[PDB]
Amino acid sequence: IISTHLAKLYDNLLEQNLIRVIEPFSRVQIEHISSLIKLSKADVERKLSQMIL
Amino acid sequence: MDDKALLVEVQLLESKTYHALSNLPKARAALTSARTTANAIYCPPKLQATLD
Amino acid sequence: MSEKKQPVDEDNWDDDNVEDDFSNQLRAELEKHGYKMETS
Amino acid sequence: PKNPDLRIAQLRFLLSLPEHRGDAAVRDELMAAVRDNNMAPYYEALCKSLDWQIDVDLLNKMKKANEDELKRLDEELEDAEKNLGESEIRDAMMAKAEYLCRIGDKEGALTAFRKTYDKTVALGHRLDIVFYLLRIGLFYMDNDLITRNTEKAKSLIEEGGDWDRRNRLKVYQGLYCVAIRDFKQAAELFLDTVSTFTSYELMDYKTFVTYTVYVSMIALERPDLREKVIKGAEILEVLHSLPAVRQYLFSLYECRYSVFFQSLAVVEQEMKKDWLFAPHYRYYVREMRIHAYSQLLESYRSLTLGYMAEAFGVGVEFIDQELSRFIAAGRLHCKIDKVNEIVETNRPDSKNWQYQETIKKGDLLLNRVQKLSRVINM
Amino acid sequence: DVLPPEADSSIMMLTSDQKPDVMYADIGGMDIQKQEVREAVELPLTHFELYKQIGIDPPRGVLMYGPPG
């Protein structure tokens, strides 16, 4: 059983990257955030929704 | 009845299947009872690394 | 203590608040609430 | 004698109140009717379902000759053998009384109860009688004598017992579910699931799990809720046994709202097959929907319904009218727009909300000290 | 004035310097004896409901002995 921990390592790795792209501003559009994170935008909304939830 | 060595086997097999069925405390306890039985075992030649 | 002015003068436990809110809004809650997907 | 008796209470309830549901409940309870010597408490279930059937005088003479054989026993016992308190007379008297609960009606049982209660000097016997009052008081859903004997049990019996009361923890919440107390007392003392054996003191265990999972989503929003329902283990395995319930939990937690309605529809339809679901099937649905909207409208000040039209479910005018009912219900502190298509919420920033509470309670107390002031001083 | 009760008669508590400064997993090799004391001392302190359920009444005290070292 290893893919359980890999998902825990993966969702740890998102929120570590996503807390680094908050400090330059208080207000931003999401497509630059997708461009800085180089991943996607729809998951990023679902992830940021979860971090406020 | 009598046995000691095969008891070490079935405790490990349960502590897998509680961990298979997502049981933290009881598998921890079944492992701990597996250890203290295995401590008086004269020979864990192979079962040791299984238990480890 | 009467005050000389009298002209004239169970089923639930307490359910007025839900019924003042929702009295008749299709309480089966399946046939439109679960069946929007055929409509869209 | 009162061991398979909660199931009977469902089959009476399942057959009586819905008329369309009358196919198999008449098939299995009729077998339960002709067995168990249930000869008092079936007249309504015979007058509300079918016309009549002759097996009646056959069972009447058997219960009478048995009762008379039981009547001739304990009178000879109290005429030959002189021991009182808790003796051979006593376990005759409860065996009459349990014969009264299983076979006869409640009235002969409760007068045999109050008769044999005054012939008790121990505490376990007095605990046993109050176990019997509460068991039959739930069977006939009597909300009168439960108000007494529970207070009688907790104050006068349960100061010497030790872990004999988890059963009466479970019976209290069971009354709270058929009452309106389905909010925070119901989930709090359902939190300890450390009994699985099913007995006179303990009902069906899977059904106990389904009740304690359905009620533990109303008490508490997410104040590390997930520690008690997900990080638990003994609750987790039995919901790991049940695919429907486990799907319902992860849909609510991980915010899978699309399947969430489908899980909610299965529950409410299954909720009809219950004997205590009456203050639920008009309350539990809308409370979860307004809880689902509460956490979704959280973290979005300028949410649009154009994202609700595919991520949440389908439809547009249905979500609009349901939000328009819920705002006008008085809850969900948000505003909806139509022609900008922006569900723009207004959450108070923890200073208005403190101020809104303090201005209500101060007005409610100033009323209370006015109304007190006018009663006094003539 | 009245002084608070037991403001005297010894000062023998261990809070905040000084500390034992060793983790529990530092001792390698006592699979029973570490497990035995922990059942007798630490386990009554937190999981008190388990003892009361069976009626074990956890033990008052513990004698340790043997050769030095």
XYZ file of C-alpha atoms in Angstrom:
592
model
C 0.000 0.000 0.000
C 1.981 2.951 -1.337
C -0.330 4.935 -3.618
C -2.246 6.087 -0.552
C 0.867 7.872 0.670
C 1.716 9.127 -2.805
C -1.591 10.970 -2.940
C -0.787 12.402 0.482
C 2.608 13.468 -0.776
C 1.051 14.904 -3.923
C -1.594 17.016 -2.217
C 1.060 18.125 0.209
C 3.150 19.259 -2.746
C 0.338 21.358 -4.245
C -0.443 23.323 -1.107
C 3.252 23.943 -0.502
C 3.577 25.433 -3.960
C 0.292 27.318 -3.695
C 1.187 29.131 -0.467
C 4.248 30.608 -2.190
C 2.160 32.402 -4.819
C 0.045 34.422 -2.395
C 2.503 36.919 -0.898
C 3.083 39.290 -3.903
C -0.526 40.533 -3.856
C -3.911 40.464 -2.263
C -5.919 40.130 -5.506
C -5.158 38.305 -8.746
C -6.621 36.509 -11.751
C -6.352 32.730 -11.983
C -4.785 32.275 -15.411
C -1.482 33.811 -14.257
C -1.674 31.481 -11.286
C -2.123 28.577 -13.676
C 0.779 30.024 -15.650
C 3.023 30.342 -12.600
C 2.051 26.925 -11.312
C 2.266 25.454 -14.871
C -0.405 22.882 -14.066
C -4.086 23.769 -14.712
C -6.796 26.040 -13.334
C -9.848 23.893 -12.573
C -8.077 21.754 -9.988
C -6.507 24.925 -8.572
C -9.947 26.329 -7.857
C -11.004 23.073 -6.227
C -7.792 23.018 -4.223
C -8.039 26.649 -3.104
C -11.695 26.107 -2.253
C -10.605 23.220 -0.048
C -7.959 25.310 1.693
C -10.545 27.906 2.656
C -13.090 25.223 3.563
C -4.087 -26.491 23.177
C -0.340 -26.598 22.762
C 1.097 -24.520 20.021
C 3.427 -21.544 19.939
C 4.985 -21.088 16.483
C 1.858 -21.102 14.325
C 0.266 -18.608 16.715
C 2.907 -16.128 15.595
C 1.762 -16.690 12.029
C -1.955 -16.084 12.536
C -1.429 -12.919 14.561
C 0.553 -11.381 11.711
C -2.097 -12.476 9.264
C -4.801 -10.731 11.248
C -2.759 -7.570 11.739
C -2.554 -7.420 7.967
C -6.269 -7.892 7.502
C -7.244 -5.235 9.981
C -4.833 -2.916 8.208
C -6.415 -4.142 4.994
C -9.780 -3.137 6.428
C -8.373 0.177 7.728
C -8.061 -0.480 11.445
C -5.444 1.466 13.255
C -5.810 0.454 16.976
C -6.744 -3.197 16.759
C -4.079 -4.034 14.189
C -1.624 -2.212 16.450
C -2.749 -4.389 19.345
C -2.663 -7.569 17.280
C 0.854 -6.658 16.218
C 1.858 -6.053 19.830
C 0.522 -9.437 20.904
C 2.394 -10.865 17.940
C 5.643 -9.307 19.154
C 5.459 -10.493 22.753
C 4.721 -14.011 21.581
C 7.607 -13.843 19.123
C 9.994 -12.728 21.861
C 10.028 -16.197 23.457
C 10.456 -17.826 20.046
C 13.739 -19.687 19.717
C 13.715 -19.397 15.907
C 12.413 -16.616 13.771
C 14.640 -17.623 10.817
C 12.343 -16.169 8.141
C 9.241 -14.986 10.027
C 11.357 -12.262 11.630
C 11.645 -10.180 8.462
C 7.979 -10.924 7.857
C 7.218 -9.633 11.349
C 9.531 -6.693 10.813
C -58.458 36.969 38.096
C -61.204 37.728 35.579
C -61.355 41.251 34.183
C -65.039 41.582 33.153
C -64.413 41.488 29.410
C -65.140 38.107 27.831
C -67.272 38.133 24.696
C -66.689 34.490 23.709
C -63.638 33.245 25.564
C -51.682 17.324 19.378
C -50.907 15.955 15.933
C -47.326 17.195 15.720
C -45.063 18.159 18.605
C -43.619 21.390 17.167
C -43.589 21.688 13.387
C -44.912 25.193 12.631
C -41.515 26.619 11.653
C -40.870 24.113 8.864
C -44.494 24.364 7.760
C -44.456 28.173 7.862
C -41.325 27.844 5.761
C -42.339 24.885 3.540
C -45.990 23.817 3.507
C -46.506 22.196 0.097
C -43.388 22.051 -2.020
C -43.562 18.426 -3.290
C -42.161 16.708 -0.170
C -41.462 13.481 -2.095
C -38.440 15.490 -3.312
C -37.495 12.996 -5.990
C -39.529 13.649 -9.072
C -38.207 17.083 -9.996
C -35.474 17.338 -7.407
C -33.858 14.150 -8.631
C -35.087 14.317 -12.224
C -33.657 17.552 -13.597
C -31.105 15.628 -15.654
C -33.650 14.519 -18.231
C -34.622 18.185 -18.663
C -31.101 19.514 -19.215
C -39.902 -12.429 25.085
C -39.137 -8.846 24.182
C -36.099 -9.803 22.099
C -37.610 -9.887 18.528
C -40.021 -7.096 19.320
C -38.571 -4.017 17.610
C -38.940 -5.746 14.240
C -42.617 -6.357 14.987
C -42.997 -2.636 15.722
C -41.668 -1.854 12.252
C -43.908 -4.406 10.519
C -46.881 -2.952 12.338
C -45.751 0.507 11.268
C -44.802 -0.476 7.716
C -48.158 -2.087 7.040
C -50.441 0.398 8.799
C -49.516 3.894 7.658
C -48.641 3.372 3.963
C -51.417 1.519 2.187
C -49.497 0.935 -1.054
C -46.943 -0.974 1.031
C -49.060 -4.020 1.828
C -47.537 -6.967 -0.033
C -44.816 -8.617 2.092
C -45.533 -7.007 5.477
C -48.740 -9.041 5.585
C -46.734 -12.106 4.560
C -44.155 -12.160 7.334
C -46.105 -10.637 10.245
C -48.951 -13.128 9.766
C -46.362 -15.811 10.469
C -45.253 -13.698 13.424
C -48.906 -13.332 14.432
C -49.676 -17.058 14.547
C -46.414 -17.672 16.409
C -45.133 -16.014 19.606
C -48.669 -16.404 21.136
C -49.264 -12.715 20.351
C -52.959 -12.726 21.156
C -53.661 -9.458 22.769
C -51.793 -6.882 20.628
C -52.933 -7.803 17.133
C -56.581 -6.705 16.925
C -55.773 -3.334 15.348
C -53.345 -4.993 12.930
C -56.215 -7.342 12.116
C -58.853 -4.582 12.040
C -56.699 -2.213 9.953
C -55.474 -4.776 7.408
C -57.678 -7.796 6.758
C -61.139 -8.862 7.849
C -60.750 -11.905 10.144
C -59.392 -15.435 10.330
C -60.111 -18.363 12.641
C -57.001 -19.265 14.618
C -58.183 -17.068 17.443
C -60.000 -19.379 19.852
C -57.248 -21.953 19.335
C -54.610 -19.638 20.766
C -56.924 -18.147 23.407
C -57.440 -21.439 25.229
C -53.717 -22.188 25.117
C -52.649 -18.846 26.579
C -55.396 -19.131 29.198
C -54.539 -22.667 30.314
C -50.878 -21.663 30.367
C -51.643 -18.522 32.398
C -53.821 -20.602 34.721
C -50.981 -23.116 34.977
C -48.816 -20.107 35.748
C -51.518 -18.751 38.070
C -51.794 -22.018 40.007
C -48.014 -22.190 40.368
C -47.190 -18.923 42.108
C -50.225 -19.075 44.393
C -49.142 -22.528 45.605
C -45.646 -21.124 45.961
C -46.811 -18.243 48.148
C -49.090 -20.577 50.120
C -46.476 -23.261 50.796
C -43.108 -21.513 50.551
C -42.594 -18.404 52.684
C -39.769 -16.304 51.259
C -40.119 -12.655 50.253
C -37.997 -9.869 48.818
C -36.291 -11.429 45.810
C -37.067 -15.136 45.996
C -38.804 -17.929 44.109
C -41.946 -15.801 44.352
C -40.077 -12.907 42.701
C -38.791 -14.652 39.573
C -42.250 -16.141 39.283
C -43.691 -12.602 39.320
C -41.415 -11.282 36.592
C -41.975 -14.425 34.509
C -45.668 -13.663 34.695
C -44.887 -10.059 33.772
C -42.649 -10.980 30.837
C -45.404 -13.359 29.764
C -47.644 -10.308 29.998
C -45.341 -8.192 27.843
C -44.791 -10.860 25.189
C -48.367 -12.132 24.940
C -50.709 -9.722 26.681
C -51.257 -5.991 26.496
C -49.372 -3.280 28.357
C -51.906 -2.656 31.135
C -51.631 -5.988 32.928
C -47.869 -5.711 32.548
C -47.550 -2.249 34.077
C -49.702 -3.147 37.069
C -47.683 -6.333 37.507
C -44.606 -4.132 37.182
C -45.647 -1.669 39.896
C -46.728 -4.620 42.019
C -43.408 -6.398 41.652
C -41.422 -3.139 41.871
C -42.423 -2.705 45.513
C -41.196 -6.260 46.152
C -37.615 -5.294 45.256
C -34.833 -4.322 47.655
C -31.838 -4.833 45.362
C -30.770 -2.459 42.601
C -30.289 -4.825 39.679
C -33.877 -6.008 39.969
C -35.007 -2.373 40.091
C -32.751 -1.724 37.113
C -34.371 -4.681 35.369
C -37.921 -3.410 35.867
C -37.012 0.049 34.547
C -35.312 -1.719 31.641
C -38.716 -3.299 31.099
C -40.735 -0.078 31.419
C -38.507 1.663 28.901
C -38.503 -1.255 26.486
C -42.282 -1.495 26.340
C -42.635 2.297 26.486
C -40.724 2.545 23.229
C -42.809 -0.295 21.756
C -45.983 1.711 22.225
C -44.068 5.053 21.795
C -45.492 6.350 25.077
C -44.034 9.784 25.783
C -45.593 9.902 29.249
C -44.053 7.172 31.381
C -40.611 7.645 29.831
C -40.604 11.116 31.403
C -40.805 9.468 34.838
C -38.842 6.218 34.898
C -35.716 7.624 33.240
C -35.530 10.301 35.920
C -36.273 7.461 38.337
C -33.413 5.417 36.880
C -30.672 8.052 36.652
C -31.265 9.563 40.081
C -32.239 6.572 42.208
C -30.776 3.476 40.542
C -27.745 4.651 38.570
C -25.496 5.696 41.417
C -24.389 2.130 42.071
C -24.311 0.620 38.611
C -21.168 0.575 36.494
C -21.281 0.339 32.673
C -24.787 -1.020 32.729
C -25.962 2.294 31.377
C -24.546 2.419 27.858
C -27.776 0.665 26.897
C -29.785 3.475 28.463
C -27.481 5.907 26.726
C -28.644 4.312 23.493
C -32.337 4.313 24.408
C -32.291 8.036 25.233
C -30.986 9.000 21.789
C -33.504 6.606 20.269
C -36.258 8.644 21.878
C -34.469 11.790 20.736
C -34.638 10.660 17.121
C -38.387 10.089 17.285
C -38.483 13.412 19.112
C -37.084 16.577 17.556
C -33.810 16.343 19.511
C -31.928 15.186 16.423
C -29.413 17.952 16.621
C -26.591 17.812 19.135
C -27.590 15.490 21.957
C -28.435 12.840 19.363
C -24.992 12.817 17.780
C -23.011 13.359 20.972
C -24.005 10.223 22.821
C -24.068 8.284 19.585
C -20.340 8.984 19.312
C -19.287 5.983 21.397
C -19.882 2.814 19.373
C -18.333 0.268 21.714
C -21.107 -2.327 21.528
C -21.852 -4.665 18.614
C -23.592 -7.698 20.135
C -27.334 -7.590 19.571
C -29.546 -8.514 22.495
C -32.502 -7.457 24.647
C -30.399 -4.400 25.534
C -28.979 -3.819 22.045
C -30.820 -3.644 18.717
C -29.520 -4.352 15.199
C -25.982 -3.085 14.936
C -25.751 -2.059 11.285
C -28.892 0.026 11.773
C -27.234 1.577 14.810
C -24.320 2.523 12.569
C -26.573 4.051 9.930
C -28.361 6.129 12.552
C -25.174 7.428 14.136
C -23.778 8.368 10.757
C -26.910 10.179 9.495
C -27.176 12.319 12.607
C -23.486 13.219 12.951
C -23.602 15.551 9.968
C -26.023 18.012 11.514
C -24.418 18.551 14.941
C -21.175 20.059 13.759
C -20.012 21.741 10.555
C -16.322 20.800 10.276
C -14.829 21.389 13.764
C -12.517 18.505 12.993
C -15.672 16.482 12.297
C -13.422 14.319 10.129
C -11.527 13.164 13.215
C -14.627 11.505 14.639
C -16.223 10.021 11.517
C -13.283 9.397 9.179
C -10.295 9.072 11.483
C -12.311 6.706 13.650
C -11.889 3.041 12.910
C -14.730 0.986 14.349
C -17.220 3.250 12.641
C -15.089 3.240 9.508
C -15.071 -0.507 8.891
C -18.803 -0.980 9.085
C -19.282 1.925 6.713
C -16.567 0.263 4.661
C -18.995 -2.650 4.602
C -21.725 -0.394 3.232
C -20.967 1.136 -0.175
C -23.959 3.503 -0.308
C -23.306 5.175 3.030
C -19.559 5.484 2.466
C -20.213 7.096 -0.906
C -22.554 9.544 0.817
C -19.897 10.585 3.323
C -17.086 11.192 0.886
C -19.400 13.098 -1.443
C -20.233 15.513 1.352
C -16.686 15.766 2.661
C -14.622 15.964 -0.529
C -17.358 18.174 -2.078
C -18.662 15.864 -4.825
C -21.958 17.635 -5.168
C -23.104 16.055 -8.431
C -23.500 12.567 -6.991
C -24.535 14.084 -3.642
C -28.136 14.578 -4.724
C -28.231 10.986 -5.970
C -26.986 9.775 -2.615
C -29.442 12.065 -0.839
C -32.344 10.817 -2.951
C -31.534 7.200 -2.101
C -31.487 8.023 1.623
C -34.833 9.851 1.793
C -36.478 7.145 -0.279
C -34.967 4.578 2.087
C -36.001 6.817 5.008
C -39.653 5.860 4.366
C -38.802 2.287 5.374
C -38.468 3.133 9.054
C -40.670 3.378 12.132
C -39.201 6.554 13.627
C -38.630 8.621 10.459
C -41.655 10.893 10.990
C -39.882 14.139 12.105
C -37.184 13.437 9.537
C -38.600 13.096 6.059
C -39.644 16.745 5.901
C -36.737 18.048 7.935
C -33.621 16.017 7.205
C -33.755 16.688 3.462
C -33.926 20.468 3.502
C -31.473 20.751 6.387
C -28.785 18.972 4.399
C -29.555 20.980 1.262
C -29.218 24.200 3.187
C -26.069 22.791 4.741
C -24.738 21.855 1.305
C -25.374 25.369 0.051
C -23.802 26.891 3.151
C -20.400 25.304 2.599
C -20.519 25.777 -1.162
C -21.423 29.463 -1.039
C -18.635 29.816 1.476
C -15.276 30.731 -0.146
C -17.019 32.401 -3.117
C -18.176 35.981 -2.916
C -18.924 36.391 -6.635
C -20.096 32.914 -7.545
C -22.179 32.573 -10.683
C -24.873 30.042 -11.472
C -23.108 29.377 -14.766
C -20.671 27.355 -12.705
C -23.565 25.795 -10.793
C -25.172 24.705 -14.052
C -22.635 21.913 -14.615
C -20.341 21.533 -11.593
C -23.146 21.352 -9.062
C -25.886 19.618 -11.026
C -28.066 20.683 -13.938
C -30.722 23.304 -14.425
C -30.644 27.056 -13.901
C -34.139 28.236 -12.959
C -34.438 25.452 -10.382
C -31.321 26.512 -8.485
C -32.470 30.135 -8.746
C -35.899 29.461 -7.260
C -34.450 27.245 -4.537
C -31.989 29.937 -3.493
C -34.840 32.436 -3.665
C -36.825 30.290 -1.250
C -33.844 29.828 1.059
C -32.899 33.499 1.285
C -36.558 34.358 1.818
C -36.686 31.543 4.354
C -34.376 33.745 6.408
C -31.174 31.736 6.155
C -28.154 31.683 3.818
C -26.861 35.222 4.266
C -26.270 35.991 0.594
C -27.834 37.961 -2.244
C -28.670 36.688 -5.719
C -28.630 38.629 -8.991
C -30.346 37.740 -12.247
C -29.088 40.045 -14.972
C -25.466 40.371 -13.922
C -25.622 36.615 -13.119
C -23.621 37.064 -9.899
C -24.618 35.338 -6.661
C -22.977 38.023 -4.563
C -22.961 37.064 -0.903
C -22.801 39.288 2.187
C -21.119 37.506 5.071
C -20.758 39.545 8.296
C -17.096 39.964 9.176
C -17.383 38.669 12.776
C -18.009 42.177 14.143
C -21.462 42.718 12.734
C -22.370 39.190 13.792
C -21.215 39.827 17.335
C -23.167 43.074 17.217
C -26.292 41.419 15.788
C -26.308 38.889 18.614
C -25.712 41.407 21.408
C -28.494 43.654 20.186
C -31.030 40.805 20.179
C -30.160 39.440 23.614
C -30.064 42.882 25.196
C -33.499 43.673 23.797
C -34.768 40.293 24.964
C -33.483 40.949 28.472
C -34.700 44.546 28.578
C -38.123 43.186 27.664
C -37.657 40.597 30.396
C -36.784 43.193 33.020
C -39.574 45.505 31.860
C -42.108 42.673 32.118
C -40.752 41.764 35.529
C -40.852 45.444 36.565
C -44.527 45.759 35.787
C -45.578 42.625 37.699
C -43.854 44.046 40.781
C -44.558 47.490 42.257
C -48.286 46.648 42.368
C -4.836 37.134 55.271
C -5.118 33.392 54.640
C -2.411 31.692 52.600
C -3.420 29.219 49.878
C -3.371 25.544 50.882
C -0.128 23.559 50.425
C 2.159 26.449 49.618
C 4.905 24.585 51.457
C 6.405 21.285 52.737
C 8.494 20.512 49.591
C 9.119 21.857 46.090
C 9.819 18.744 44.023
C 8.115 19.122 40.670
C 9.689 18.712 37.272
C 8.453 21.463 34.993
C 10.579 23.277 32.436
C 14.293 22.811 33.276
C 14.803 20.331 34.471
C 13.797 17.619 32.053
C 14.788 13.983 31.543
C 15.648 14.711 27.857
C 15.263 11.299 26.227
C 12.681 10.008 23.807
C 10.686 6.880 24.536
C 12.074 5.014 21.515
C 15.687 5.476 22.571
C 15.858 2.228 24.534
C 16.338 -0.568 22.072
C 15.507 -4.022 23.312
C 12.811 -3.997 25.980
C 9.767 -5.101 24.049
C 8.037 -6.391 27.182
C 9.391 -4.247 29.988
C 8.779 -0.936 28.251
C 5.384 -2.314 27.318
C 4.781 -3.486 30.878
C 5.352 -0.174 32.677
C 3.431 1.771 30.034
C 0.418 -0.469 30.643
C 0.689 0.265 34.337
C 1.349 4.013 34.417
C 0.743 5.882 31.169
C -2.173 3.754 29.954
C -4.299 4.337 33.116
C -3.738 8.052 32.703
C -5.398 8.453 29.289
C -7.450 5.353 28.482
C -9.258 5.065 31.780
C -12.523 3.942 30.184
C -11.086 0.573 29.172
C -10.223 -0.414 32.744
C -13.572 0.707 34.127
C -15.386 -1.333 31.480
C -13.759 -4.606 32.467
C -13.243 -3.687 36.103
C -9.496 -4.159 36.191
C -8.654 -1.433 38.792
C -5.171 -0.567 37.508
C -2.272 -1.356 39.839
C -1.016 1.044 42.452
C 2.695 0.387 42.102
C 5.631 -1.348 40.496
C 8.893 -2.902 41.694
C 11.839 -3.001 39.299
C 15.010 -4.928 40.057
C 17.929 -6.889 38.696
C 21.644 -6.460 38.109
C 23.120 -2.997 37.542
C 23.334 -1.624 34.033
